[PDB]
């Protein structure tokens, strides 16, 4: 919960807490005003995180594809899960490998009046029980999976025609996302890698969208939030201040990697 | 009662309604205790005016219609204010504390006052954890918000408060930098200006609709609190050396706090915001 | 029974009705020794006058009216009084002890007397904690209030007693500075004057409606208690050296306490207050 | 050391600390002056405790009988041991059944420049090694011994003609010292009992002195010290104050027993 | 350093000579710090005048011949005074503390000053336990005797001090009842009058031969100590909340102590007794 | 070797002489890459210029005169400097570390270099505790004083150094507010200005006698350190995910630190003070 | 002292010389009671005749010649015999006990008697283990061999005794099947006939050279032992219920054992064998 509290400090507060990049339709960050407090950047980060889910819901046709029984795989603190439940009436099974996050997801779901439509599953992945699902959504979580196995499992729990919707960092050339990979412990692969994994399991790639330019401004706002905290928070412990300095360095390295050509922030949709 | 709670209970009177905030003196004069100057006489007077603070708050905030529904009592202490809204105004109170050992105390006294069904406790760091008590009609924070991140707190409040719902605050504010440093450092509080609160509340969709100065009306609390400590030091021959030393330190802090209260840098205010 | 309780039960027991307070002797004289002067003869007589004290208290306090409802027995000891009010007057008794070990004993005793349904135990420290037992009709404190902060206690009683309700007290009071110091220091109490109790009660919203002196009617208790102790020391060869020393100290204390009962500085009083 | 500290508060401080009654040659306590503090009574108690040892040294002819290799049996905190070492040059084996008192005896002996002439033995009693002794002294300690066994042991470690010197509470009639007995855990016996125990072991009774009147004032000063503490010490814990009240009660009971005829404070001397 | 020692060491300067007693200001004026008002500037000035207290004591007590032999330093703190008599006057010092963790500190600094052979520590409650360091020529107690039973302490001293030997005392005394209550209660001390000390010393065979008032010359210690605390609160942005709160309390205590120092009820005295 | 020390020995070792400070490049330029760009090639070059830094320091400070007696090596790391002064100049070195784990390592290393008799370890916290090591002729602090309270440190040095004795410092200083914040926050130091050091030293009784800028001669260290890290990441497939992330963070930090070395807010200085 | 040993020391002590065997009464009559019949009077008399038994044994066995060299005291109990041979005849005694708890007690006792240098303790089980104590001149077993395998014991003695050396035994023997069953079952021994001992000794290489009956001279021991027990029961009110029951059993056993001593089935014999 020390890790978690640091994440909530930056991306919260509840009820909807997101842990993924934000979407900037004009491909630029909002101009700095005279409010450059941490809170001003935190608000803007959250605004464009919501913006990513709203942009994904458009291109994915959430009204009919994400409004039934869906799996939220790698649900973080539940911000996506609550978004599909609240905004599209979906019944959501939110999957996390972190047991201490499961009551946070469920409590915020109650606070939003969708406690009946949001249930957690803790696993590393599992359960074919709990019927067949209309869809599975993975927002920046699949970098952690064995894609071949994951897609085979999905084939067993998704109805024919069901959709698999993915937002993810992909490589476009070897080592193109090494900074991302080593700092977040992900194994990014190419879009073709995901297509072949999905094909071997009975899924067809039906949509492939590049949103690299539109998500690049996230790193600028994330860097500015981190610098604002370092400049303005005198209560930081030496350890906490060192971690934020490290996060600032990684954020600059990550933004530069984002621009260097070897990385692709993509939205994918598969159909069983 | 653990040790620090027991000391609080010794000073702020017995249950069922135990208050941990300044008292309100409508005339801005300390009572003249002209015959009984015993510790208990100062204690009963402090309690009388702590209750008077809540009655005054109920008056200016229109508790009859604004605090008689389903309300959050944020930083409830030992439940004194929680029981007051429940009993005197029929409120269904969710009392929020960060001290797990205080939760049984609040619930017990609520059952003793016959309102056990309309007072429940959540043990929470500020208000960061989920709140599923349906939408709320109001939140009240009596001298607790100095411990909170105001921008985040008002954002939580905006989600669980209905439109038109009220945030009612009594608090020590600064009027200039370092204006409440003794208050801040001795109570581990982070006092901000009223405008800081309004800025944070505005950003989260609240409107300021009441902003009341009660600095001179609360200054006599410090005189009564000082006199109480002196009376105990003078009369209780059974204090341990450690306990006597803590009271002597409390006496010194009370003098410095009353001095700071008068130096112009501090405002004891009552605020009320409405959810847009 | 832990060691302290077991020694108490030897002197004042056996169950189910055990009292731990002085006894009342209407003649203000100790019964003359008969041919039986064994420890059991003095124990029976002590128990008889302890029950007698409760009977006298029920008289002057009109317990049929005032102590037959829902009452608090504050400092119930081993429940003797609690069972008395429950049995003799059909009271619904909430029995308050500072010692969790006595809590199950009192309940077991109440079962044995058939008033299990009308005796309830509470385990707190001098009433400082919530009492969710609904409004009470009365509170009785037999030799227990010497341990209490009287202004605080009466404030607590003020909230949990209905208007008109009675607070009934039997207690050692001082009538003079240091008038009960032997009692205070041997039993860890803080005896105060009747006026002190009256000021504390008035500040909380009670009126003093009855104030009875019973000093000379309780002085024989110390004579019988002394004689019980001497008879155990004279007759019981199974005593350990430690238990024998403890009884020798009790004997000395009983004589010093009885002397102090007579020096004029102490009063054994019955008070009644009404909210 | 809580027990010990309470004893040192009343009878100390070092280097010479005595735990026995005091001797008052005129058989009355000094008049109370306007100093009735605990310290004034403590000083007077210690003065007459020293007085008891000086009176015993006279009647026992300490110059020649207590100036060689002696046993101090039941040495308390060593006040007697240091007295014989310092005042008569004796080499002293100080015997205690309390191991934590043995460094107190030895340290105060060093402080008095007689550390070479004072050695402790911890036992419950023992050691025939450490040669034969010229004498054994027991000041208010023998009430705790099996006198028959004790005297048999002494016969094995004392030279012929060696002296055994005893200050003790004796009974003069059954139950005559019951208060003393039960409060201090002693078993007082008659002088004849000690004589027969000693005779069976080869010791002859050569001196038998009654000092009951001369020691009675000890109880008056001991009672006055206790009352002075109770009146003047506001730092006492409830437990500590109750113990002092109990000590006051016992002191009155003990003084009354002292006067009632059944108790004898005696000095005895035996010769092997 | 454990936590409370570390805080003492932070304020009373680094080793090897660390003093825990008031400072002496011969002119009774606080130094005017007219350019450098940093925490370190007040610290060095406090230390300068603590050393000046020992030099003044050495002067009035004739340390050259009275404190240059085998002496007891009773309640030695962290050894500052112990090292001073050993270095500046060649004394063989038996340093007595009631804090076992301070014994290694004193011995270490004595070895660093090259006097490790002439400074030894005994860890003792007051002076009740045996003292076999042969007869002593003097005992010195700098602001430690307020913790002692004086009648007993002087009786111990009478046994281990040679005839003509000196007891040298610096201490806060009362001049009237409750004259040092803030001092007493905040430091767990039991201050008595000078006459009380003389009575206790007389009963044990000591004669009073020097009785010096130094109250006004020590009052500036409290001003410098107050300024030091203020400077740290104003400048050390790295204090924890707990540590900052303790310093704020120390600041309040220092103001009240300096106030008590001036109210007439307290005397900072230097006494010297001689064994008859 | 605990985990942190083992990773340090991988980069700067092997023993017996291991330095933990920047290296000195007289040309102010990094050596051009040859055909060998394995981690070991950069490690050797880094070690060569770390030794070079000590050789330069011994030069400007006249160690044959000033650092050949009884000296304190304050913050000795893994003893590289301590062994240097002992070996190259026959010093009697008292080696001070804040980490008891390095204490036996330095001693084992000194044995291996034959100066076991002239290297002694002390395990304290920033010199705050007694130093019974007799008067010292000098104290050397290579990149260690950033951790210290400078007024206190210099006061301590004032007591344990003979008059004339030298305090020899290599350190990152600010030349501007927040000029070394990346260094400060990544290494937990508190860099101050040279004037700050000078004020602290003067208050304790030292004079500043030498003040040398070496910023540009130490900038290549960050280039070689960066390249070492890249070469390990590119070539070592046995790394755990955790160790790989740690090295990726070190790489980023090395670039940020080298950028800051160049921004003009930081100075790598050599000072000498004389008591 | 553990509990069993402490009760033994109460009856037969005090130190330093404590015997645990019957006593010898030359008149074959118990001393007539004097006016002193306290437990201590019987204890002294019992101790006197236990010493007397050893004096008689030293006589018939010529200890000045045969028991003044290097001897084994097999089953030394609390060392009374061991100290006797060491003191009265200057023997170098190797003291063998089956109970390690008695080993330090015997040594402490020997120090107290000044024969610490001539008394040595061995802690084995009935001599079954190596005895590196050089050739022994004699072995003495006072009431201890009843616990032994006699053929094995005598074989062991055969190896560790010089030719001519003496084995000296005092023991309860049967003169009839089941003649000492009370003794056997109460003390856990296996008494055998003198012929059994003689056969076992002859098989190992010993000749029987002395065979003395002492049954009637030891019968008074049981009378004095009985009387000691009665006097403790009659006079000692500090006894616990458990210790009082233990003494009542000892009293009954002492009477049954004394009756059996008289029934003719048991012999208290002194034997001497020579290798
Ligand atoms: N996996 C298939 C759809 C399965 C349809 C089964 N009815 C695609 O392509
Ligand atoms: N306690 C009562 C009135 C008694 C007098 C108190 N002012 C109500 O009703
Ligand atoms: N115990 C004897 C003295 C023993 C003498 C031995 N030489 C008396 O009477
Ligand atoms: N520290 C030197 C003098 C340098 C200047 C300090 N005032 C001495 O000797
Ligand atoms: N044991 C002796 C001889 C005795 C007879 C045994 N055969 C040898 O020598």
Test E131 with D115 for CB contact under 8 angstroms.
no
Q: Could you say which ligand is closest to the alpha carbon of residue D132?
A: 3
Write the DSSP assignment of D50-64 as a string of letters.
Answer: HHHHHHHHHHTTHHH
B270 to B20, B58, B95, F6: CA distances (angstroms): 16, 11, 20, 60
What does the block give as tokens for B42? 């100062």
Name the E strands within chain B.
70-74, 92-97, 119-123, 136-142, 161-174, 206-213, 266-275
Q: Which residues contact F243 (CB under 8 A, 6 or more apart)?
A: F7
Q: Does D236 touch chain C (CB under 8 A)?
A: no
The bridge status of strand C119-123 relative to strand C136-142 is unpaired
> Domain of B17?
2-219+253-274
Which of F132, F200, F203 lies at the smallest CB-CB distance from E112? F132
3-class DSSP state of F82: helix
Bridge partners for B95 per DSSP: B73, B121
Cis peptide, bond prior to residue C254, ω within 30 of zero: no
Give the CATH number of the domain where residue A257 resides. Answer: 3.40.50.150
Helix axes D2-11, D38-59, angle to 10 degrees: 80
What does the block give as tokens for E272? 């010297």
Residue F124 Cα to ligand 1 midpoint, Å, equals 71
Test E248 with B182 for CB contact under 8 angstroms.
yes
Residue located nearest, by CA, to atom 7 of ligand 4 = F205
Write the DSSP assignment of G136-175 as a string of letters.
Answer: EEEEEEES-GGGS-HHHHHHHHHHHEEEEEEEEEEEEEES
Residue G273 Cα to ligand 5 midpoint, Å, equals 10
**C230 found inside a domain:** no
3-class DSSP state of C261: helix
Measured in whole angstroms, the distance separating CA A182 from the mean position of its chain's CA atoms is: 18
Residue located via tokens 């077993």: G141
The bridge status of strand B92-97 relative to strand B70-74 is parallel
3-class DSSP state of B15: coil
Which of D8, D43, D111 lies at the smallest CB-CB distance from E132? D111
3-class DSSP state of C217: helix
CB of C170 within 8 A of CB of C60? no
**F246 found inside a domain:** no
Report the residue of chain D nearest E136, measured CA to CA: D111
Q: Residues before each break in chain F (C–N > 2.5 Å)?
A: none
Closest CA to C126 of C137, C136, C141, C138: C141
H-helix or E-strand spanning residue B143: none
CB of B260 within 8 A of CB of B182? yes
Distance between CA atoms of residues C96 and C94, nearest Å:
6
Bridge partners for C272 per DSSP: C168, C210
At least 3 CB pairs under 8 A between chains D and E:
yes
Q: Which residues contact D44 (CB under 8 A, 6 or more apart)?
A: D29, D30, D221
What does the block give as tokens for E103? 């014994």
Q: Could you say which ligand is closest to the alpha carbon of residue D272?
A: 3
Name the E strands within E110-179.
119-123, 136-142, 161-174
Suggest the residue from D156, D185, D197 to mutate for an interface test with chain G (most G CBs closer than 10 A).
D156
Residue located via tokens 């950028």: F259
**D82 found inside a domain:** yes
Which of E9, E15, E40 lies at the smallest CB-CB distance from F130? E15
CB of E225 within 8 A of CB of E46? yes
CB of D164 within 8 A of CB of D203? yes
At least 3 CB pairs under 8 A between chains D and A:
no
Residue F202 Cα to ligand 4 midpoint, Å, equals 9
H-helix or E-strand spanning residue B140: strand B136-142
* Phi, psi at F198, each rounded to 5°: -65, -45
Distance between CA atoms of residues C112 and A72, nearest Å:
63
**D259 found inside a domain:** yes
* Phi, psi at A201, each rounded to 5°: -105, 0
Question: What burial class does residue B125 get, using C-beta atoms within 10 Å of its C-beta: 0-12 exposed, 13-18 middle, 19+ buried?
Answer: exposed
CB of A229 within 8 A of CB of A38? yes
What does the block give as tokens for E101? 């963790």
Name the E strands within E77-130.
92-97, 119-123
Q: Which residues contact C112 (CB under 8 A, 6 or more apart)?
A: C15, C16
Q: Judge if the beta carbon of residue A202 lies within 6 A of ligand 1.
A: yes
**E236 found inside a domain:** no
**F65 found inside a domain:** yes
Distance between CA atoms of residues F177 and D258, nearest Å:
87
CB of E128 within 8 A of CB of E98? no
H-helix or E-strand spanning residue E183: helix E181-187
Cis peptide, bond prior to residue G14, ω within 30 of zero: yes
* Phi, psi at F38, each rounded to 5°: -70, 160
Distance between CA atoms of residues E192 and E183, nearest Å:
12
CB of A21 within 8 A of CB of A265? yes
Q: Which residues contact G161 (CB under 8 A, 6 or more apart)?
A: G135, G136, G137, G138, G139, G167, G275
What does the block give as tokens for E153? 């302490």
Question: What burial class does residue G151 get, using C-beta atoms within 10 Å of its C-beta: 0-12 exposed, 13-18 middle, 19+ buried?
Answer: middle
Sign of CA dihedral B64, B66, B70, B76: negative
Bridge partners for G93 per DSSP: G71, G119
Conformation bin of residue D76: beta by default, left when phi > 0, alpha when psi is -120 to 50: left
CB of D110 within 8 A of CB of D132? no
Helix, strand, coil shares, percent, chain F, to 5: 50, 20, 30
Ligand 3 atom nearest to CA at D204: 9
Closest CA to B216 of B34, B9, B28: B28
Q: How many structural domains does chain G have?
A: 1
Distance between CA atoms of residues F203 and A152, nearest Å:
74
Sign of CA dihedral F192, F196, F197, F203: negative
Measured in whole angstroms, the distance separating CA F170 from the mean position of its chain's CA atoms is: 7
* Phi, psi at E138, each rounded to 5°: -170, 155
What does the block give as tokens for D128? 């025939």
Q: Which residues contact B185 (CB under 8 A, 6 or more apart)?
A: E233, E244, E245, E248
**A234 found inside a domain:** no
CB of C23 within 8 A of CB of C225? no
Distance between CA atoms of residues D191 and D168, nearest Å:
9
CB of G166 within 8 A of CB of G105? no
Bridge partners for G268 per DSSP: G172
Distance between CA atoms of residues A226 and A243, nearest Å:
10
Q: Which residues contact G47 (CB under 8 A, 6 or more apart)?
A: G12, G19, G23
Bridge partners for D137 per DSSP: D72, D165
Task: Give the CA diameter of chain A.
Answer: 56
Distance between CA atoms of residues G164 and G16, nearest Å:
32
Name the E strands within chain G.
70-74, 92-97, 119-123, 136-142, 161-174, 207-213, 266-274
- Structure-derived torsion over alpha carbons of residues B2, B3, B4, B9, reported in degrees to the nearest 10: 80
**B109 found inside a domain:** yes
Beta-carbon-side half-sphere exposure of residue D245 (alpha carbons within 13 Å): 22
Q: Count CB neighbours of B238 within 10 A.
A: 11
CB of B20 within 8 A of CB of B77? yes
* Phi, psi at C3, each rounded to 5°: -65, -45
User: Which chain D residues have a beta carbon less than 8 Å from that of C252?
Assistant: 246, 249-250, 252-253
Neighbours of chain B (3+ CB pairs under 8 A): A, C, E
Q: Count CB neighbours of A262 within 10 A.
A: 19
What does the block give as tokens for A260? 């260097």
User: Which chain G residues have a beta carbon less than 8 Å from that of D197?
Assistant: 40
Closest CA to B97 of B71, B122, B116: B122
Measured in whole angstroms, the distance separating CA D153 from the mean position of its chain's CA atoms is: 21
What does the block give as tokens for A234? 């005198």
* Phi, psi at G194, each rounded to 5°: -65, -40
Distance between CA atoms of residues G195 and A262, nearest Å:
109
Question: What burial class does residue D3 get, using C-beta atoms within 10 Å of its C-beta: 0-12 exposed, 13-18 middle, 19+ buried?
Answer: exposed
Distance between CA atoms of residues A144 and A238, nearest Å:
31
Bridge partners for G211 per DSSP: G271
Distance between CA atoms of residues G130 and E72, nearest Å:
62
């Amino acid at each position: 919960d020390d890790k978690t509290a640091k994440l909530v400090r930056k991306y919260g507060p509840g009820p909807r807490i997101h842990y993924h990049v934000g979407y900037y339709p004009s491909s630029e960050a909002p101009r700095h005003t005279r409010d450059v407090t941490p809170d001003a950047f935190r608000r803007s980060i959250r605004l464009h995180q919501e913006g990513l889910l709203r942009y994904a819901a458009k291109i994915w046709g959430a009204e009919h594809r994400l409004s039934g029984r869906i799996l939220d795989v790698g649900c973080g603190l539940g911000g996506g899960s609550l978004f599909w439940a609240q905004e599209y009436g979906a019944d959501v099974t939110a999957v996390t490998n972190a047991p201490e996050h499961a009551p946070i997801v469920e409590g915020f779901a109650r606070e939003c009046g969708v406690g009946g439509r949001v249930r957690t599953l803790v696993c590393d992945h599992l359960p074919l029980d709990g019927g067949p699902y209309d869809a599975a959504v993975a927002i920046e979580s699949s970098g952690y999976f064995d894609r071949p196995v994951w897609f085979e499992r999905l084939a067993h729990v998704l109805r024919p025609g069901g959709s698999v919707c993915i937002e993810e960092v992909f490589t476009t050339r070897p080592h193109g996302a090494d900074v991302w990979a080593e700092y977040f412990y992900t194994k990014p692969a190419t879009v073709l890698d995901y297509a072949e994994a999905a094909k071997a399991a009975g899924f067809e790639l039906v949509d492939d969208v590049d949103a690299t330019s539109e998500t690049l401004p996230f790193w600028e706002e994330s860097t500015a939030w981190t610098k604002a905290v370092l400049d303005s928070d005198s209560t930081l412990s030496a350890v906490d201040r060192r971690q934020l300095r490290i996060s600032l360095m990684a954020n600059q390295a990550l933004g530069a990697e984002w621009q260097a050509g070897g990385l692709r922030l993509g939205f994918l949709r598969f159909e069983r």
